Coordinates of C-alpha atoms and ligand atoms in Angstrom, one line a residue:
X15 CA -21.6 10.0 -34.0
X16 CA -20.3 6.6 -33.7
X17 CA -20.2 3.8 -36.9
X18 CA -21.9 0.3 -35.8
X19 CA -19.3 -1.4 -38.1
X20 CA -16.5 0.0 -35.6
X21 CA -18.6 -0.1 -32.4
X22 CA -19.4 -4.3 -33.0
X23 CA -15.7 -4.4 -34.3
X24 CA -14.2 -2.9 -30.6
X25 CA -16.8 -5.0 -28.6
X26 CA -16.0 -8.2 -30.7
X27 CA -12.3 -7.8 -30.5
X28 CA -12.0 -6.8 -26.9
X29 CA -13.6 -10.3 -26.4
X30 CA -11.8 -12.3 -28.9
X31 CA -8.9 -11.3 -26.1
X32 CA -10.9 -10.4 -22.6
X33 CA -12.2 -14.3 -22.6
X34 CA -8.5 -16.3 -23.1
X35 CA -6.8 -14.0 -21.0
X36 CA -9.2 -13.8 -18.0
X37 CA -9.2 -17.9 -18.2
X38 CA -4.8 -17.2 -17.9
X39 CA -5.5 -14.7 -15.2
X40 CA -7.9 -17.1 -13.2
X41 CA -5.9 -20.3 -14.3
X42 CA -2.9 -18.3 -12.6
X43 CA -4.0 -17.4 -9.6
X44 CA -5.7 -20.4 -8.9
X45 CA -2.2 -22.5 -9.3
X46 CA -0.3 -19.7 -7.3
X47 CA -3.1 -20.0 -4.0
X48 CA -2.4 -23.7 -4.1
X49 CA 0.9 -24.0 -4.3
X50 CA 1.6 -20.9 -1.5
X51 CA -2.2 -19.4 -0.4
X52 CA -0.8 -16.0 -1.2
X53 CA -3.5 -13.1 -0.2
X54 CA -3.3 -11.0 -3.6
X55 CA -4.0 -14.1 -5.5
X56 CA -7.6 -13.9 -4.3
X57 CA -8.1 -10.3 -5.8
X58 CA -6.6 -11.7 -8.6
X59 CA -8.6 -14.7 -9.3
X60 CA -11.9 -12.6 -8.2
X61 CA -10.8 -9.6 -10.4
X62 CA -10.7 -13.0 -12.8
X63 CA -14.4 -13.8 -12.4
X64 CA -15.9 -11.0 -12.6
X65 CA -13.7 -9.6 -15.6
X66 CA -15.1 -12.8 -17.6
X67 CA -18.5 -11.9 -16.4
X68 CA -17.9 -8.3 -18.3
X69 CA -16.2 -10.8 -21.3
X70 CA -19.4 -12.6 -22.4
X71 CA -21.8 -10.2 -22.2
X72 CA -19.6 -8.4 -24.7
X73 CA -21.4 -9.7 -27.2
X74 CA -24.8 -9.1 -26.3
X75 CA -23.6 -5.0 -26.6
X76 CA -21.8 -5.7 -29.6
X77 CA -25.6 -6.8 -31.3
X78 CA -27.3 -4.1 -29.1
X79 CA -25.0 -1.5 -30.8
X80 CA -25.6 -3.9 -34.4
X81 CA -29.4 -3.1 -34.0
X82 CA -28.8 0.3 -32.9
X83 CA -29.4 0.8 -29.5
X84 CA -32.3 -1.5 -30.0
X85 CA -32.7 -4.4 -27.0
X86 CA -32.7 -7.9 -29.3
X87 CA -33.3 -10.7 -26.6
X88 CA -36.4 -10.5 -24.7
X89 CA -37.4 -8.2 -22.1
X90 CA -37.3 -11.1 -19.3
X91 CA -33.2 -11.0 -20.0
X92 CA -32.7 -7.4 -20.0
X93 CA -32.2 -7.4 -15.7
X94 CA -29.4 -10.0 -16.3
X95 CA -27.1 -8.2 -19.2
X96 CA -27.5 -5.0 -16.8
X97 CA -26.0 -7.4 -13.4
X98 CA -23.5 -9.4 -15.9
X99 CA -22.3 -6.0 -17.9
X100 CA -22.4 -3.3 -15.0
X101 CA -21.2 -5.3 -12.0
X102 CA -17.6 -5.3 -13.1
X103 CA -17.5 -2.2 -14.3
X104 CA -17.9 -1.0 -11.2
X105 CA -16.6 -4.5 -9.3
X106 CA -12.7 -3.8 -10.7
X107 CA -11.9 -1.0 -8.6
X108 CA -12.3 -2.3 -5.4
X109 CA -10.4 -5.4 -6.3
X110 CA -7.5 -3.3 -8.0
X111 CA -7.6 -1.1 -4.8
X112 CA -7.1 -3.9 -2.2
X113 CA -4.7 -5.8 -4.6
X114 CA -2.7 -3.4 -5.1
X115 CA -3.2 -2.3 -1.6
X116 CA -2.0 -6.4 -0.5
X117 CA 1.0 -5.3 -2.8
X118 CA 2.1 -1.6 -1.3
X119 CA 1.3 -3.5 2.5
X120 CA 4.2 -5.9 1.5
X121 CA 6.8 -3.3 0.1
X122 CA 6.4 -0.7 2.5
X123 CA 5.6 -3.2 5.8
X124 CA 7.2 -6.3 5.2
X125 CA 7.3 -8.2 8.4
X126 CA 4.1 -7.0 9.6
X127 CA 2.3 -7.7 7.1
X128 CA 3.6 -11.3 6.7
X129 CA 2.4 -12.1 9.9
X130 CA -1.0 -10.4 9.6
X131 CA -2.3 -11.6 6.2
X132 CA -4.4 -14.5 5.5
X133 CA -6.6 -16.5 2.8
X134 CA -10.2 -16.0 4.7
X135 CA -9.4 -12.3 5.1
X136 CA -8.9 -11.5 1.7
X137 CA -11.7 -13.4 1.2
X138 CA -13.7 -11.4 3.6
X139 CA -13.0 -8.3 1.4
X140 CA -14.1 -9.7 -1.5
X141 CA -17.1 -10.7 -0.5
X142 CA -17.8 -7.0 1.0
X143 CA -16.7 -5.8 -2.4
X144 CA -19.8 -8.5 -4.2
X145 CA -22.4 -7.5 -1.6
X146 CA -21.3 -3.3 -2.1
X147 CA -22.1 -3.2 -5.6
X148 CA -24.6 -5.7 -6.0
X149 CA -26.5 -3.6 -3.9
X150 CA -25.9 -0.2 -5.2
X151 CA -26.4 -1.4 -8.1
X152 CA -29.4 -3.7 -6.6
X153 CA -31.1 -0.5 -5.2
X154 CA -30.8 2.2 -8.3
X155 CA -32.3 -0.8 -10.8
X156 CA -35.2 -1.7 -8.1
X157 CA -35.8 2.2 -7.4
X158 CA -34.9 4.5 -10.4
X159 CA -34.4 2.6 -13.5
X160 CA -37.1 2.7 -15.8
X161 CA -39.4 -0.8 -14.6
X162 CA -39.3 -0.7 -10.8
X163 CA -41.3 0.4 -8.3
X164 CA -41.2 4.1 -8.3
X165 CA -41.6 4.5 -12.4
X166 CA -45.7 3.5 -12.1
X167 CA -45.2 2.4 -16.1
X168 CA -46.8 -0.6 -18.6
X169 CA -42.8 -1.0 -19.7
X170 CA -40.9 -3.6 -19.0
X171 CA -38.0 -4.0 -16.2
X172 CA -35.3 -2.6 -17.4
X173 CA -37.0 -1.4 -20.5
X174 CA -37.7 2.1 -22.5
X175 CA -39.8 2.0 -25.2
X176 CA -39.1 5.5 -27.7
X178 CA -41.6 4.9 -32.0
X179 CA -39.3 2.7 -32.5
X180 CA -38.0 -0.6 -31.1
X181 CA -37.7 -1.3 -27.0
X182 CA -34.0 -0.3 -25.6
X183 CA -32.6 -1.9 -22.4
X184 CA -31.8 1.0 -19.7
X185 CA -29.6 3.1 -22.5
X186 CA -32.7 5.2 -23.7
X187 CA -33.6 6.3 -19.6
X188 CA -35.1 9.7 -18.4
X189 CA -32.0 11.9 -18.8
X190 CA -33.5 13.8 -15.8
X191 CA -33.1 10.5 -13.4
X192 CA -30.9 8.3 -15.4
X193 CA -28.2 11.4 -14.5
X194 CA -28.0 11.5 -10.4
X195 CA -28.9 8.0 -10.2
X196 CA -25.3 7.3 -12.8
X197 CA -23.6 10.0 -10.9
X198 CA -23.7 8.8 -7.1
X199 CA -22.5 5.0 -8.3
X200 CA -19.3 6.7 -10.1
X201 CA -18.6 9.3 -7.1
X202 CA -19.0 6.2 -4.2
X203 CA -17.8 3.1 -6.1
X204 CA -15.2 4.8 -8.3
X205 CA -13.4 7.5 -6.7
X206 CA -12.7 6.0 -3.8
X207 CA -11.1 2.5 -4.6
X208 CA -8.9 5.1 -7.5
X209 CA -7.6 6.8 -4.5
X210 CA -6.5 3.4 -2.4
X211 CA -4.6 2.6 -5.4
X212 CA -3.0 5.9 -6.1
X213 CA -2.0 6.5 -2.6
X214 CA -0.3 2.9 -2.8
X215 CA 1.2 3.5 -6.2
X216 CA 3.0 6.5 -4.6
X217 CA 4.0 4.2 -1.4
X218 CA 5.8 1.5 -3.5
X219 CA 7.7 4.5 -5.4
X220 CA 8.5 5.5 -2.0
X221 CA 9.2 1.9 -0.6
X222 CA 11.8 1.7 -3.2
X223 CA 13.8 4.7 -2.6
X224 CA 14.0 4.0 1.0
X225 CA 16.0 0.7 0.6
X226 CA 19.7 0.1 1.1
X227 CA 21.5 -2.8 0.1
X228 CA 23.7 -3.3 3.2
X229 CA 20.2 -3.2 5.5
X230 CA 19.1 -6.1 3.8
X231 CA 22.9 -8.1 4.3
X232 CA 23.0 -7.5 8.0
X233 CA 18.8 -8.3 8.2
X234 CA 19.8 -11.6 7.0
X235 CA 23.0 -11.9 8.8
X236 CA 21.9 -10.9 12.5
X237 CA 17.9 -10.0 12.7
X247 CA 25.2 -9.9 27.7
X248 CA 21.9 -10.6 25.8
X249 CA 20.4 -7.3 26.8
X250 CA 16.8 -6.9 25.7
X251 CA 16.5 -3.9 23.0
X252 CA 14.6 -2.8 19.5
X253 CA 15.8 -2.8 16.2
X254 CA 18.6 -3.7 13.9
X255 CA 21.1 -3.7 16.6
X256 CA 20.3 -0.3 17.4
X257 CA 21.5 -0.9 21.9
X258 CA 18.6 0.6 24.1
X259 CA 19.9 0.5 27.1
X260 CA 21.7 -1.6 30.2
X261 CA 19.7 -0.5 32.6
X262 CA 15.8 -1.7 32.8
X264 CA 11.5 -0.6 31.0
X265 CA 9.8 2.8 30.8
X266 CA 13.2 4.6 31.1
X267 CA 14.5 1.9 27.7
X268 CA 10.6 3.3 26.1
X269 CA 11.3 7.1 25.7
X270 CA 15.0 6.5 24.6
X271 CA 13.2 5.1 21.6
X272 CA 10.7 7.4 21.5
X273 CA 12.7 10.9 21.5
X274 CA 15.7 9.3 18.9
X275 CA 12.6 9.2 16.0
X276 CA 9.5 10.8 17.3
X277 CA 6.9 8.8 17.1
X278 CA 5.4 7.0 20.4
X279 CA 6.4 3.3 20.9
X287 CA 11.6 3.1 10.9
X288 CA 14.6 0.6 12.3
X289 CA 16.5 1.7 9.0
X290 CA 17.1 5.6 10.5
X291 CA 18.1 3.7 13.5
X292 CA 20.5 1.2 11.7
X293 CA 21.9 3.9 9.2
X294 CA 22.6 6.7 12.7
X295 CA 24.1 3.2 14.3
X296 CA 26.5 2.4 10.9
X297 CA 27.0 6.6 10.0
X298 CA 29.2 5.9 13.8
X299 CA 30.4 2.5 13.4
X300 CA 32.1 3.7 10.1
X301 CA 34.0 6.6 12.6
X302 CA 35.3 3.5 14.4
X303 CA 37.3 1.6 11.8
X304 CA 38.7 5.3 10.8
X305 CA 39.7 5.3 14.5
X306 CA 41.7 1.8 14.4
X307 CA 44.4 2.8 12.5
X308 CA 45.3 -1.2 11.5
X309 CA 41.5 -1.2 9.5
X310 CA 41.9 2.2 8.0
X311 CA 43.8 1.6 5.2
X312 CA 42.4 -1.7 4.0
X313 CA 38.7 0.2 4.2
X314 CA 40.1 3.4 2.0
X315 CA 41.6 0.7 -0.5
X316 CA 38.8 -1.6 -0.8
X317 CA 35.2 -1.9 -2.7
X318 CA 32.1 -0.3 -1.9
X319 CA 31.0 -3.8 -2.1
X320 CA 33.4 -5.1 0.1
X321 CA 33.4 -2.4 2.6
X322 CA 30.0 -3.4 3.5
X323 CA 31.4 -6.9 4.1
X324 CA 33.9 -5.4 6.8
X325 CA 31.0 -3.5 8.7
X326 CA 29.5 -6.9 8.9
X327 CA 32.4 -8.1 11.5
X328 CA 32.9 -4.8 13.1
X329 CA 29.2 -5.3 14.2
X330 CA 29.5 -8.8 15.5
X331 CA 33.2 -9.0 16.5
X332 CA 34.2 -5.1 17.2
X333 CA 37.7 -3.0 16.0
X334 CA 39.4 -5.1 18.2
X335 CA 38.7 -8.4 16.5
X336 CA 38.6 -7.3 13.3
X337 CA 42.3 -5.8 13.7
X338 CA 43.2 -9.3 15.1
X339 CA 43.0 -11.2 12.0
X340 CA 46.1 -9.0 10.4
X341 CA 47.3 -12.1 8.0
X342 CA 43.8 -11.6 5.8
X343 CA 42.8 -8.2 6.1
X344 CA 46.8 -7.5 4.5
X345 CA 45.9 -10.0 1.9
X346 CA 42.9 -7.9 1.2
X347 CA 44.9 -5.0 0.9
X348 CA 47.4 -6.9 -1.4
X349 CA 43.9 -7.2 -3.6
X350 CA 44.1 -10.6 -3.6
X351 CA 40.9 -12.1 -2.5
X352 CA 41.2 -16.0 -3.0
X353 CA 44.2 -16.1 -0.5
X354 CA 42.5 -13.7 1.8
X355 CA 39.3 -16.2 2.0
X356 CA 40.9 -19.3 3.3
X357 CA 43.0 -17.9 5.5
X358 CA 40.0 -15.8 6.6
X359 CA 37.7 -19.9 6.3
X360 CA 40.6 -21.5 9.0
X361 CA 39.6 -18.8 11.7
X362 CA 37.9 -18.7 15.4
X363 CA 35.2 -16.7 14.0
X364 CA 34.1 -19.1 11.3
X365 CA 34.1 -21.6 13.9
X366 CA 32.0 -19.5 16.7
X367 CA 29.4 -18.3 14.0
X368 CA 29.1 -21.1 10.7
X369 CA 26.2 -19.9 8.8
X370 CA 27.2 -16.2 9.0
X371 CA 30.9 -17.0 8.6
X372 CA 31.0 -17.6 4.9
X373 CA 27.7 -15.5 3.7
X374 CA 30.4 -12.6 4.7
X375 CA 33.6 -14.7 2.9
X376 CA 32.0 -15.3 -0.2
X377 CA 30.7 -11.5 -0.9
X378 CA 34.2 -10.4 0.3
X379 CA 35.5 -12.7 -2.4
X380 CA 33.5 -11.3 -5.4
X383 CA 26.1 -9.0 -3.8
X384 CA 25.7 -12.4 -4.9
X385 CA 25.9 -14.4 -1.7
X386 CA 22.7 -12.3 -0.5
X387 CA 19.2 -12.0 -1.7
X389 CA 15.0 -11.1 -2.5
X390 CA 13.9 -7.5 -2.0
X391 CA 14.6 -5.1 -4.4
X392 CA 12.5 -7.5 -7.1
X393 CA 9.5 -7.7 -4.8
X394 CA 9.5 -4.0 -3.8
X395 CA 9.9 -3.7 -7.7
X396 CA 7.2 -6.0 -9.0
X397 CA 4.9 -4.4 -5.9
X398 CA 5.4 -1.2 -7.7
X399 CA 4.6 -2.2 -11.0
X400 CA 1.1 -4.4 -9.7
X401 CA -0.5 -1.2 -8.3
X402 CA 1.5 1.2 -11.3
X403 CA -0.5 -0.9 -13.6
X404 CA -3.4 -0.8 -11.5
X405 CA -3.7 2.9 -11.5
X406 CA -3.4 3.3 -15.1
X407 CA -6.3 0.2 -16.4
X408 CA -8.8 2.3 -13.7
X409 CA -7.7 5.4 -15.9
X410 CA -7.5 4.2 -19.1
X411 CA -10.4 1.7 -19.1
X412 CA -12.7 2.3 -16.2
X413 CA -12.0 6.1 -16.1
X414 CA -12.8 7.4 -18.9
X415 CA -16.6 5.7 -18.6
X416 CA -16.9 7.0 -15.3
X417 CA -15.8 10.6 -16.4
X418 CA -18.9 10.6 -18.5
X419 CA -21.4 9.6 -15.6
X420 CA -20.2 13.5 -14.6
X421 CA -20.2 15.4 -17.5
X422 CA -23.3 14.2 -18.8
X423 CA -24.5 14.7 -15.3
X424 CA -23.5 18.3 -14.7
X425 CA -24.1 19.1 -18.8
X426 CA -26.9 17.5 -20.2
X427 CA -26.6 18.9 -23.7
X428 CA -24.6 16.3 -24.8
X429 CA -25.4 13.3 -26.6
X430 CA -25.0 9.7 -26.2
X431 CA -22.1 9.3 -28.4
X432 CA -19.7 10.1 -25.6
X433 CA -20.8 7.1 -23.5
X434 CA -20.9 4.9 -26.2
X435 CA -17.1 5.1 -26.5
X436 CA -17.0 5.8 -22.8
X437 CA -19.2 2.3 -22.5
X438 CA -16.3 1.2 -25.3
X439 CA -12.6 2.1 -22.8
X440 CA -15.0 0.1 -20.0
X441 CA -15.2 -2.7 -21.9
X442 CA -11.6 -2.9 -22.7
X443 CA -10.9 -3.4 -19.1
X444 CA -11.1 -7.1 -19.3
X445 CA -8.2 -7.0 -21.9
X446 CA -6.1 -4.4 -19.9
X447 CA -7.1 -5.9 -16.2
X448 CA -5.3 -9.7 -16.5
X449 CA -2.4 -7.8 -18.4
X450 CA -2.0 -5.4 -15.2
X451 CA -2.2 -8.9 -12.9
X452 CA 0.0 -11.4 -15.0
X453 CA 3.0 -8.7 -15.3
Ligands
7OS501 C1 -4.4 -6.1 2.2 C2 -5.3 -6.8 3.2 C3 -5.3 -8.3 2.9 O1 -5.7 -8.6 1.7 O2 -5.1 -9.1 3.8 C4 -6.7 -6.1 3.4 C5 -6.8 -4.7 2.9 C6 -6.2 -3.6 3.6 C7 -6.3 -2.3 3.1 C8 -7.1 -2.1 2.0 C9 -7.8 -3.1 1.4 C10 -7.6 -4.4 1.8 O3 -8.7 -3.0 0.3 C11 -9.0 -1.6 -0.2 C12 -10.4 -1.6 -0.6 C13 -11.5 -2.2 0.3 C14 -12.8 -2.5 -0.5 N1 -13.2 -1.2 -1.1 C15 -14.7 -1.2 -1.7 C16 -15.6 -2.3 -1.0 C17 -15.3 0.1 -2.0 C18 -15.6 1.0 -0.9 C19 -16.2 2.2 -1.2 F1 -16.5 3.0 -0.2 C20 -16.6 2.6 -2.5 C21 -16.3 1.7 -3.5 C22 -15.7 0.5 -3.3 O4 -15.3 -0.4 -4.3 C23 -16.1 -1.4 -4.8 F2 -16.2 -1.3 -6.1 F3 -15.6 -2.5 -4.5 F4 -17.3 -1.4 -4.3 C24 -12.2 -0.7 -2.1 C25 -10.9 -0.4 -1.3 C26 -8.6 -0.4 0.7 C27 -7.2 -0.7 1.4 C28 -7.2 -6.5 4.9 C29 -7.9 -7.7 5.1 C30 -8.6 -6.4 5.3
MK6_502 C1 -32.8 -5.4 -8.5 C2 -33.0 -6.6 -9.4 C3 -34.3 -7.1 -9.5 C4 -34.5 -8.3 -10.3 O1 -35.7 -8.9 -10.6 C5 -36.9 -8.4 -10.1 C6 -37.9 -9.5 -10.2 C7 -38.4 -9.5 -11.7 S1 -40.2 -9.7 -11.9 C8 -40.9 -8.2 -11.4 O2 -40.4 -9.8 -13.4 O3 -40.6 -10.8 -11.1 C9 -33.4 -8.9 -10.9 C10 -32.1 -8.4 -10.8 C11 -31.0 -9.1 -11.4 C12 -31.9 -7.2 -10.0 C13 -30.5 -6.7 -9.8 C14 -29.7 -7.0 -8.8 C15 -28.4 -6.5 -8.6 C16 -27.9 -5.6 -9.6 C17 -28.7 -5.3 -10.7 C18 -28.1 -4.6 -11.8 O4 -28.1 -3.2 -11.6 C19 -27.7 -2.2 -12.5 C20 -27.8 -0.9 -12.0 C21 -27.5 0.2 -12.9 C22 -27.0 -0.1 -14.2 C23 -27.0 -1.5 -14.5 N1 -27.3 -2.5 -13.7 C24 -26.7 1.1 -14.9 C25 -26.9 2.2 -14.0 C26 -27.5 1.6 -12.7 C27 -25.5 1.8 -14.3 C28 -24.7 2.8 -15.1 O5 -25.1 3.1 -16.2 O6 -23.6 3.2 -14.6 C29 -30.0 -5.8 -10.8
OLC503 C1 -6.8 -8.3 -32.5 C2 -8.1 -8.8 -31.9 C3 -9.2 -9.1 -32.6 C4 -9.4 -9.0 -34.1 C5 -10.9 -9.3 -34.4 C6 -11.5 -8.5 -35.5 C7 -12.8 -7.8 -35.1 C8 -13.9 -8.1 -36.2 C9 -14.1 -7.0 -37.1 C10 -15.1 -7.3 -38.2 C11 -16.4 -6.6 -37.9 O1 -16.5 -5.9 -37.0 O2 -17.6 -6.8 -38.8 C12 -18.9 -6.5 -38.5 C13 -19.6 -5.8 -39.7 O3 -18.8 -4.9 -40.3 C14 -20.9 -5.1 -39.2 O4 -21.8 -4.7 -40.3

């Protein structure tokens, strides 16, 4: 059982909202493509469209449920709610899934990625993701559903009539209308939930693999000897002999954190060694220590011992002193850019960026993503199963099933513009 009065009042207000939104949402992503041609911004101006497409056809159900069940525009119309109010329905997982797929791709592979990703291909998956369900969909309507060309019928496309007045595709075969709902929820549904679970889980785990000094020598760095990683030395001799040396130290054939961290987990055994360094690295912040590390990679103990005026003034605690004496210096004339990035943070993070936020935001895209597809999405789809395996149960399910689907184009832009 299900009231009409509260069935056209959720229709009616998830519209009110869906519509202004979705226009923000498209408006958005449209701006963002122009101004940078990001590939996410593509799933999120096509989630856009067909989200809107869901949006005014809103109304249409809320009068369907008015009269009951009952189809009140004509029969000729019925094939075109079904395309404009089960597309997305089905349509918004696959572009949550690659979206927040673009967004785990770009927190868990950074560099990669950047140099893979494109406009046109994230266009390309788009238009896979149109052609999928317009077919599936295109195929069970043509074939099963009650007016094509297996049901040898007088009705009309689309159409059921009960006595009583004629209902669009709602009042179907229970016999049919059940594997026919069933195999659209188990291909189209399950799959694109798993994509953006699985990614979900990597941006969780993109976050805890971080650390902050990485990121301060990634910017700072990035004989001449040719070797792999963040500084992490290969070899001096030369190639296949340099390729298993990398290959045995992680385990995998032909990831440069483990490398950096085993390479700074020694270098830190070094500055205990120098017995002039020592002291100031036991006395100083856990900040600042990572500003030291900085120059024992690109000078060594030996030149980091040498400039004994400032690294005593930073023992002293006194950190303005310390900086220009440390600014009038053969380092910050072999090396300027790097020079005072390392001055600066020594001084008082804030001198480097630009990670943590994206690997943050990428989190919360496909964290948001998982829980529209199982709060609005889902719980439809969860009936096209139950009613499926148990066909006891009545229509009043679906309807609010029908009902959390529809408030997808309220939850979906909110999930994007956050
Ligand atoms: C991030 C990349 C970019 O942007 O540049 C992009 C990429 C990489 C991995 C995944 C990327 C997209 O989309 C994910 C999608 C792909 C489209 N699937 C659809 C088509 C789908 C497949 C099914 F078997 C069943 C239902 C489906 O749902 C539907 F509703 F859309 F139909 C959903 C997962 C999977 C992971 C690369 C250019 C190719
Ligand atoms: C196949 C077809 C034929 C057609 O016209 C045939 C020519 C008309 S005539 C014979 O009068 O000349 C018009 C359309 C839009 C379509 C068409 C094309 C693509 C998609 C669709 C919409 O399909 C569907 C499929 C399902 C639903 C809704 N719409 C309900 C079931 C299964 C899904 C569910 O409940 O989960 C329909
Ligand atoms: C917050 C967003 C929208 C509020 C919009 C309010 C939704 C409209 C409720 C009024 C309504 O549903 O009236 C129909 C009538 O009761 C049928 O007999």
């Amino acid at each position: 059982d299900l009231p009409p009065q509260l069935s056209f009042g959720l229709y009616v207000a998830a519209f009110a909202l869906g519509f202004p939104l979705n226009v923000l949402a498209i408006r958005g992503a449209t701006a963002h493509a122009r101004l940078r041609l990001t590939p996410s911004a593509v799933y999120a101006l096509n989630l856009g469209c067909s989200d809107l497409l869901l949006t005014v056809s809103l109304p249409l159900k809320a009068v369907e449920a008015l009269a009951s069940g009952a189809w009140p525009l004509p029969a000729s119309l019925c094939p075109v709610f079904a395309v404009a109010h089960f597309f997305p329905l089905y349509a918004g997982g696959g572009f949550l899934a690659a979206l927040s797929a673009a967004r785990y791709l770009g927190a868990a592979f950074p560099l990669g990625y950047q140099a893979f990703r494109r406009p046109c291909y994230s266009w390309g998956v788009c238009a896979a993701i149109w052609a999928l369900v317009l077919c599936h969909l295109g195929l069970v309507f043509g074939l099963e559903a009650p007016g094509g060309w297996l049901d040898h019928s007088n009705t009309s496309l689309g159409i059921n009539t009960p006595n009583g007045s004629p209902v669009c595709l709602e009042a179907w075969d229970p016999a049919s209308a059940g594997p026919a709902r069933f195999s659209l929820s188990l291909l189209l549904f399950f799959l694109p939930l798993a994509i953006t679970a699985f990614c979900f889980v990597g941006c969780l785990r993109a976050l805890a693999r971080g650390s902050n000094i990485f990121e301060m020598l990634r910017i700072d760095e990035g004989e001449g000897y040719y070797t792999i990683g963040i500084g992490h030395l290969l070899t001096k001799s030369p190639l296949n002999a340099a390729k298993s040396e990398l290959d045995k130290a992680i385990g995998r054939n032909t990831e440069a954190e483990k490398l950096f961290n085993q390479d700074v987990d020694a270098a830190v055994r070094g500055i205990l060694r120098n017995a002039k360094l020592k002291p100031v690295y036991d006395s100083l912040d856990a900040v600042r220590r990572a500003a030291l590390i900085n120059m024992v990679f690109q000078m060594g103990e030996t030149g980091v011992a040498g400039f004994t005026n400032s690294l005593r003034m930073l023992q002293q605690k006194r950190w303005d002193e310390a900086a220009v004496n440390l600014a009038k210096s053969r380092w910050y004339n072999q090396t300027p850019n790097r020079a005072k990035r390392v001055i600066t943070t020594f001084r008082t993070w804030d001198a480097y960026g630009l990670t943590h936020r994206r690997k943050l935001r990428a989190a919360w895209v496909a964290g948001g993503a998982l829980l529209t597809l199982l709060l609005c999405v889902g719980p439809y789809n969860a009936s096209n199963v139950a009613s499926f395996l148990y066909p006891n149960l009545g229509g009043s399910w679906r309807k609010l099933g029908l009902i959390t689907g529809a408030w997808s184009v309220v939850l979906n832009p909110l999930v994007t513009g956050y």
